[PDB]
């Protein structure tokens, strides 16, 4: 739709500001290595020369420590047990994998963790026997809320010597919430308690795993057709290669840049240059992207070896230019869960504007509550609900025959694409701001809003919007490949 030279120029500019802002963040990290180390205890390792890692990101360090210690071995054991069951007892493989999932949960979280998972699953099943969507959702929400009760938290913490085990239990139960809610809502043979236990105690997704639809799980656990062993080894080899590449990329990002430590020190984030701010935002979003790429590629690889089709991994955040695409293609599993069980039951987007607003509000409110329900989470939810609603409204307005005819008559297709890129620039800026609120909280959001949109309205804002305009041209050009279908 655009000249090849023009799109090449936009791609060059996009890579340019990406890498230059990364370089600026690296320089700022080198300047304040001593201060950040004193204040946040940067870790020392030999992976990248004498560089020191930034371990201030809780999720990355938590899951890396767990994988070093126990989870990698348990995942390998699940892989081996699944292959052995396929070779020996294919018809009983779901139950062997259920048994292995329960045993691994016992190994990491002890008896209390398995007992809690079973209690939640049984309560959800019993409530689902009353085939009412409202009752099932109320039960799931109450079980989710129980995780945040101070007394329950104290009792749970008394079970484990270390805090990491308690956090692992909390994450496991948070994901089990989605899993057994999915099962119960689909329930409204093939939906019996053994199948629910197999679905819940499926190890690849036990801790932090993406929501895998029960329909696909049961359909693909009863297939009885499997790929040869050599094909499984080839798939495992390629998946491991890509996973190691992604893990190395995340470690390199944490070593070169200390985005997490800098975001922790608001006073520092308020005195860095504008290029450093942009680079910090890009590095934060891309580190989150690569982190969940690694955290879903292990479950995804295990499911692929098991013969399941896992939800698609997140798409490069440096190709996302809109709220709708961002939330369609980043967490595909959770997006599908929300579409089927939250968005559509409350009318989706087929009951006028107000219905669409209400459905989006319910979806984002549930997502924020699931993530913890903190004030910054609610803020993120409000911002993203507003962004998605505005995008849907503009899309509908343009889709009207009158507006479409006027645009075709007045503006050339190149002009239309340029206008689309200009709008997507502001959309991307707001999306980045909301996701920075998510990652760094309200202080980071206030800092970015003031230093980019208030204290730098004349030229900082226009520079950011021009760079995001080039970025959005490049993102729409790429989205033509997949977004069309």
């Amino acid at each position, epitope marked *: 739709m655009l000249p090849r030279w023009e799109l090449a120029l936009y791609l060059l500019a996009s890579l340019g500001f990406h890498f230059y802002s990364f370089y600026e963040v690296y320089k700022v990290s080198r300047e304040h290595e001593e201060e950040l180390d004193q*204040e*946040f*205890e940067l870790e020392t390792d030999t992976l990248f020369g004498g560089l020191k890692k930034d371990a*201030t*990101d*809780f*999720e990355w360090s*938590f899951w890396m420590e767990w994988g070093k210690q126990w989870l990698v071995w348990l995942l390998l054991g699940h892989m081996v047990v699944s292959q052995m069951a396929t070779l020996l007892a294919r018809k009983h493989r779901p139950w062997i994998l259920m048994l292995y999932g329960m045993w691994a949960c016992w190994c990491v979280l002890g008896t209390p963790g398995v007992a809690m998972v079973l209690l939640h699953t049984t309560i959800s099943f019993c409530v689902a026997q009353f085939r009412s969507q409202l009752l099932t959702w109320l039960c799931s929400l109450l079980l989710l809320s129980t995780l945040r009760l*101070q007394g329950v938290e104290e009792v749970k913490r008394r079970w484990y010597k270390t805090e990491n085990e308690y*956090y692992l239990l*909390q994450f496991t139960l948070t994901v089990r919430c989605l899993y057994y809610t999915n099962f119960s809502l689909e329930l409204c043979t093939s939906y019996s308690f053994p199948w629910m236990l197999a679905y819940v105690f499926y190890y690849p997704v036990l801790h932090n795993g993406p929501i895998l639809s029960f329909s696909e799980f049961i359909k693909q656990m009863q297939q009885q057709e499997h790929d040869s062993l050599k094909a499984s080894l080839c798939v495992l080899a390629l998946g491991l290669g890509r996973l190691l590449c992604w893990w190395w990329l995340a470690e390199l990002m944490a070593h070169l840049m200390y985005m*997490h430590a800098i*975001y*922790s*020190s*608001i*006073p520092l984030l*308020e005195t860095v240059s504008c290029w450093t701010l942009g680079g910090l935002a890009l590095a*934060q979003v891309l580190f*989150f992207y690569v982190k969940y790429l690694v955290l879903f590629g292990v479950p995804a690889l295990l499911m692929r070896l098991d013969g399941l089709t896992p939800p698609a991994l997140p798409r490069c955040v440096s190709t996302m230019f809109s709220f709708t695409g961002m939330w369609r293609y980043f967490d595909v599993g959770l997006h599908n869960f929300l579409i089927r069980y939250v968005y559509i039951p409350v009318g989706g987007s087929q009951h006028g504007l107000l219905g669409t607003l209400f459905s989006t509000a319910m979806t984002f409110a549930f997502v924020s509550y699931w*993530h*913890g329900g*903190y*004030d*910054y989470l609610w803020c993120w939810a409000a911002l993203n609900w507003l962004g998605v609603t505005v995008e849907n409204g503009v899309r509908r307005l343009v889709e009207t025959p009158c507006i479409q005819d006027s645009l075709a008559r007045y503006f050339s297709p190149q002009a239309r694409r340029r206008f689309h890129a200009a709008l997507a620039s502001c959309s991307t800026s707001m999306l980045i701001l909301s996701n920075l609120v*998510f*990652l*760094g*909280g*309200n*202080e*980071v959001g206030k*800092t970015y809003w003031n230093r980019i949109f208030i204290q730098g309205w004349p030229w900082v804002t226009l520079s950011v919007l021009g760079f995001l305009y080039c970025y959005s041209h490049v993102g729409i050009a790429w989205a033509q490949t997949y977004a069309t279908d």
Partner: nanobody
Amino acid sequence: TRDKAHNTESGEMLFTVKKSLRLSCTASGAIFSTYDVSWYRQAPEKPRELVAIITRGGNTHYADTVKGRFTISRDNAKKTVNLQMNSLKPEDTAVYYCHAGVQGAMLGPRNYWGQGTQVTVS
């Protein structure tokens, strides 16, 4: 006048010297620079209510009922949080809870509550 509420029987003018209260909350085994420390109070037969909060960026907020009277500060070096309570009134009698909580998905689900300390006045 010369009343028993004004002076002693000898004839010396009475006056009540009122003292302030300064709660403290030291955090151990944490990266104290990343927490939005806060002070809650739970008066008897009432729910716990936020008294003050100082975010990791230093931004400070106070409950409307303690604005100006109470002052909250943090010392990242000493890893302590202090609530300087002045002009105490009987309504301030409650159990005061120190709270430490990070804000932002990068920092994780760090949410810690103090055991609580009793503050009584009048």
